[PDB]
């Protein structure tokens, strides 16, 4: 027999986010709406920054302001709301200074410590349930070098 | 770099299930079977129903009769027994009032009491050990409001 | 809602592992490295084994030699030890005669005596401290009936 | 039957925490409250510092201000104290003397006595019970030699 | 290094059980079987109640009628029977008075006195052994405030 | 609140052990080790054993011989030594007769007379001193009736 | 409505691959880049071979020597490491005898033990980071009978 495996890599020589057990992140996650609290579980997971030169500062920002949409209704819409390091993200951009990331905290150079994401949803009127169907939308988190 | 994370959410302002510490049901589960007693292990979980509206029954059915097949041989068939607060679930719908599922034990309101949910299969014929392979099923769990 | 659970199970008629409490055994193990001793700790479980006959020899291999990778570097390797009935497991097949097993010890039959599964692993080279970064590997346990 | 059980392991040459018995420190904890006194139980264990090199100070900080979290409303937080060594730890780094930690108080060689590591929370307001629900949290504690 | 230890709890602002020196109820217990007279041992353990408001009585119930069940054989069950404060607990909600509890007994304000927990089980039929193997089982103390 | 309080049970219709004073024995045992003496203290417990049939002999035995091992380094072994009844007990099985055993010497049927237990450990070259570290290992002993 | 579903199926009679749970491989895998450490994450998944005669041996080796190459250059490569029990596959073919390969190890006649699948790709000159931008590439595994 032959076995065709395509192989494909995406190579970024200053930075790039991988997990805290050294794994790439997830290209899909699930939320839960649970009918009680009017609400919407959150995801996180722990991330540690790879970085070429570990001098200097980190800026992180959202490409765009990511919602969650019926897969059947363009209309309905779902604001979709993304945190990393602690603090809030969105289309303006944030600073991250090189020393607060706590960069070779372990035996390996280049390597931060552990950094939390945060993805989660919300109803885009409080306290209203949103209507049924499924849901869909990408979060495109974009991380650049100081 | 970008990272292009896929969000989706199902939502049924109504009625679901979740863990009773707050998370979504496995996908996924794993059954082990013992060849001295021709048995296999029992999969338990305690779930928690949330509602919208904690006066009325719930109705739980099955969407088909779950059957274990070898992923080899799709004639291999073992039965899947489900079920859920104590009582079998079959395509013939339960109906579970609720006063007995004790809604708002806790200081959470449309959240009752732990429900178990039991997932097990075992051998179409009585004593007689199954084909050696490995075996595949979906469980379809229907959960509606009265 | 509807709640598509996946059922999955692989069936061997004649023999298996299972936990001296009737559980399946973990898919997966952490050790830890102390820097004082350059060592690391070992992991072990108590297991039993079931059979379908209990008066055949049991055969015990691995299917390769496992070997701690580092995940960031596929040339740094950790060689991993596995024992277990308290013999040193490897590539050539160990033997296992049914009266040292002590089958039917309890009141079950076909069920032997507890036997001791050790996991660890060694520095390649001794008294040198293994490179910082996260290692894995997979331990491939073969048992087979005599 | 074949088992493919991961082995999995993080190597630091210089530094790390472990059980005053010997073991890894736990991967959870939980915490009890309790109504009559506004008050969560705090979670107390003996560690035991294991160092390449014991002349040398200890820096022990945390990687962000851990905060208990509704699973269900990321909206409610509650702050989580850290001690270790009989001093609250902070984003802020601590310093401790090699001596100070008593190297080779028993015949091993690099392990200090015995450290004292607390966990606990409170609410975010004094004097007022927090809303019910199930929460969790991250602490991400970090050790570096000086 | 880097340690993430996850810290969880569950906030009720109302009641809980905690135990007579001011520990969290144990998670697992154990029973144990003599042949001679035919009977499990029971477990006991003193715990006290607290509560935001004193001057309320205590409804305490089970979610379901606990079984130990085998963990190789669905169909073999064994009823457990369970008491709180010397009376048989059941799914119909038994009711006790706050001066029967005895409130501030202590210093403390809002802790009851002690009462005594009983867990146990028997085989389903009178003066039978139960078959062999390991059972398991779930007890679902729920306790709500008046 | 809800308390999901886990009850397990192993039962063996035809034999146990138990303490003299009707519990179960305990699940670990600690020896202390006098340099003075170069030897570790035993541990003794008075043991009871309950039959269903008191007209059958007694036969004790180990599963495996018990080692005291190293938690950080495996190679470091010290054997245990283990004696029920009066006799050293080891792989080879022993016998005791029913009349040996004293059973219904007090009013209850089924039930032995009172036997000691005596677990202990000593360095695997005599007269010289273990190496430094904290050790740990299991006993597992086996008792079938005849 | 009518759907047209196409139905491609591939068939060797003598030998083919599947992973350990029975599934097909995949035809595309992901590798991740990390700037910190100049390498590239390698993939690994179990296999199992499945021939029509268990007593020939098996010959693994590559129709061309893979390499990643940029989509928008094709001058710039990286060259792509393929290994397969436990040894580095080239265009030279390897050898792999029956014996070594366990064949029948489970129930299943004609299915060998798991067998280690491994890609990788590493910059093609040592300590240089490569040029960004998206890079593919095919690995075609070729597989016959002895």
């Known amino acids: 027999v032959e076995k065709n495996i395509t192989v494909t890599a995406s190579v970024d020589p200053a930075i790039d986010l991988l997990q805290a057990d ?3 992140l997830p290209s899909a996650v699930k939320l ?5 609290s009017k609400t ?3 995801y996180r997971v722990m991330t540690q920054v790879h970085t070429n030169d570990a001098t200097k500062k980190v800026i992180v920002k959202l490409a765009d302001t990511p919602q ?3 897969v059947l209704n363009s209309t ?3 604001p979709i709301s993304v945190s990393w390091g602690g603090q809030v993200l969105s289309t303006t951009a944030k600073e ?3 020393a607060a990331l706590g960069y070779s905290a372990s035996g390996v150079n280049g390597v931060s410590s552990s950094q939390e994401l945060v993805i989660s949803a919300a109803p885009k009127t409080a306290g209203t349930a949103p209507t049924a169907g499924n849901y869909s939308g990408v979060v495109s988190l974009v991380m650049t070098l100081g």
């Open 32 to 36: 839960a709406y649970s009918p009680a």
């Open 22 to 24: 050294g794994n790439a």
């Open 68 to 70: 969650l949409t019926d």
């Open 40 to 42: 919407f579980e959150s």
């Open 96 to 98: 991250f200074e090189a």
């Open 76 to 78: 309905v819409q779902m």
